[PDB]
Amino acid sequence: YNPPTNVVSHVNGDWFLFGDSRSDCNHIGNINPHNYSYMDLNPALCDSGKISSKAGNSIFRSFHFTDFYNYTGEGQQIIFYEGVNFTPYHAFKCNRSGSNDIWMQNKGLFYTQVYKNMAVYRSLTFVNVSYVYNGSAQATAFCKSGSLVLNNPAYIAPQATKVEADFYLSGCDEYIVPLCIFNDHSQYYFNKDTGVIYGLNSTETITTGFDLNCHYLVLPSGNYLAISNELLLTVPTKAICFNKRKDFTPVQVVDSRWNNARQSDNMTAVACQPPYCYFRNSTTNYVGVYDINHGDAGFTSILSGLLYNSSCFSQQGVFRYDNISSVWPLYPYGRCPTAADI
């Protein structure tokens, strides 16, 4: 009896968690009353030095908006428990005429690149992208909804019939940058070292509004050039920074959603696929004790696997022991049991 269990865990001590208030030990200082029941993470892991988490935030939210947290962490086995802090609930769009679906599509495309690459790099952090433009027209902040203000990519208008800007990716093995457009102007990023050109022409669509479509390029270091044919130019101000190549190690991603009253999405589930990712989810509504949206038994149970080492990680779940079981593990990592007759 060694069943596949619905938890995130680790083979050894070499792991790292990226999360939000539900695993942010520092949030307790900002709330009254002061206790840890808002967390799904067990408080014994607070001192572990293996968690980079921030209340109200997500990796995607930090990537695109001024509400920035510098998520930073290193490990062989990466675990994610965030994403909810940019959801349909927030109803983000650039204008009144925008579309939240475009932004849900972006969320899904972004996290796909995060997960794929964190299966091959130990280290994730942010860097500020140095960009230079001689057409000093400032940035406008041309995309706002409530307290969410877009600052990556930056907008540049022309001031002192074609606009360009230089940017520089440095210090990391590989970087994610956003390349975006509103769905008649084109947008190119050009690597001057390699000669590779990435671009986006604008084209209409039938079932959406009018908002910023982003693609997330996984780029090398180099001296780049952002170019545009018409008036507006978009350029990266932030990048996910990948370091320290490792043997392929699937990441673990926990479903980050609200209580059913608020509207959530399944874009991290879409992004999380085999062989690079295992998706864990409770079989219940998120019903928190601190408030309705924080401190749930189902998700506390999933995260409880971080309190011990486990042998084998599979699509069905985690097997603690490496010898025998009654189910064949799919897409395994670690020392895995057989389910043959012996």
Ligand X SMILES: *[C@@H]1O[C@H](CO)[C@@H](O[C@@H]2O[C@H](CO)[C@@H](O)[C@H](O)[C@H]2NC(C)=O)[C@H](O)[C@H]1NC(C)=O
Ligand Y SMILES: *[C@@H]1O[C@H](CO)[C@@H](O[C@@H]2O[C@H](CO)[C@@H](O[C@@H]3O[C@H](CO[C@H]4O[C@H](CO[C@H]5O[C@H](CO)[C@@H](O)[C@H](O)[C@@H]5O)[C@@H](O)[C@H](O)[C@@H]4O)[C@@H](O)[C@H](O[C@H]4O[C@H](CO)[C@@H](O)[C@H](O)[C@@H]4O)[C@@H]3O)[C@H](O)[C@H]2NC(C)=O)[C@H](O)[C@H]1NC(C)=O
Ligand Z SMILES: *[C@@H]1O[C@H](CO)[C@@H](O[C@@H]2O[C@H](CO)[C@@H](O[C@@H]3O[C@H](CO)[C@@H](O)[C@H](O[C@H]4O[C@H](CO)[C@@H](O)[C@H](O)[C@@H]4O)[C@@H]3O)[C@H](O)[C@H]2NC(C)=O)[C@H](O)[C@H]1NC(C)=O
Ligand U SMILES: *[C@@H]1O[C@H](CO)[C@@H](O[C@@H]2O[C@H](CO)[C@@H](O[C@@H]3O[C@H](CO[C@H]4O[C@H](CO)[C@@H](O)[C@H](O[C@H]5O[C@H](CO)[C@@H](O)[C@H](O)[C@@H]5O)[C@@H]4O)[C@@H](O)[C@H](O)[C@@H]3O)[C@H](O)[C@H]2NC(C)=O)[C@H](O)[C@H]1NC(C)=O
Ligand V SMILES: *[C@@H]1O[C@H](CO)[C@@H](O[C@@H]2O[C@H](CO)[C@@H](O[C@@H]3O[C@H](CO)[C@@H](O)[C@H](O)[C@@H]3O)[C@H](O)[C@H]2NC(C)=O)[C@H](O)[C@H]1NC(C)=O
As for the chain, the residues directly before each break of C–N over 2.5 Å are 160, 183
Site string for ligand X, 268-297 (x = CB under 6 A): ---------------------xx-------
> In this structure, what token pair is assigned to residue 206?
């039938």
322 in active site = no
Q: Cα(141)–Cα(143) distance, rounded to whole angstroms?
A: 6
| 291 catalytically annotated | yes
Q: Which residue, judged by CB position, is nearest to ligand NAG in the bound state?
A: 229
Burial class (CB in 10 A: 0-12, 13-18, 19+), 321: middle
Tokens in use for 209?
A: 């509004």
Check residue 164 for interaction with ligand NAG (CB under 6 A).
yes
By CB under 6 A, is residue 309 in contact with ligand NAG? yes
In angstroms, rounded to a whole number, what is the distance separating the alpha carbons of residues 297 and 285? 10
Residues of the shown chain interacting with its own copies in the complex, contacts defined by CB under 8 A: 181, 183-184, 186, 188, 190, 192-203, 215, 247-248, 274-276, 321-324, 328, 331-332, 335-342
Out of 9, 62, 294, 311, the active site residue is: 294
Q: Which two tokens stand for residue 104?
A: 């849900």
Minimal distance, residue 156 CB to ligand V, in Å: 11
Does residue 325 contact residue 339 with C-beta atoms inside 8 Å? yes
CB 182 within 8 A of CB 106: no
Token readout for 306 is 């971080």
- Is residue 211 part of the annotated active site? The answer reads no
Give the interface segment with ligand V, choosing from 101-109, 161-169, 204-212, 304-312 (CB under 6 A).
161-169
Specify whether the CB–CB gap between 39 and 22 falls below 8 A.
yes
Contact between 230 and ligand V per CB under 6 A: no
Distance in Å, CB of 196 to its own copies, minimum: 6
Sign of CA dihedral 17, 19, 21, 26: positive
Q: Name residue 210's beta-bridge partners.
A: none
**Residue 289 interacting entry, from its own copies, ligand Y, ligand X, none, C-beta within 5 to 8 Å by type:** ligand X
Tokens read off for 140: 């406008």
Give me the least distance between CB of 305 and ligand Z, in Å please: 17
Positions that interact with ligand V (CB under 6 A)? 132, 134, 164-166
Positions marked active-site: 21, 291, 294
The residues that touch ligand X, with contacts defined as CB under 6 A, are: 12-13, 33, 35, 37, 68, 70, 72, 125-128, 289-290, 308-309, 321, 323-324, 342
Binding site for ligand U (CB under 6 A): 255, 260, 266, 269, 281-285
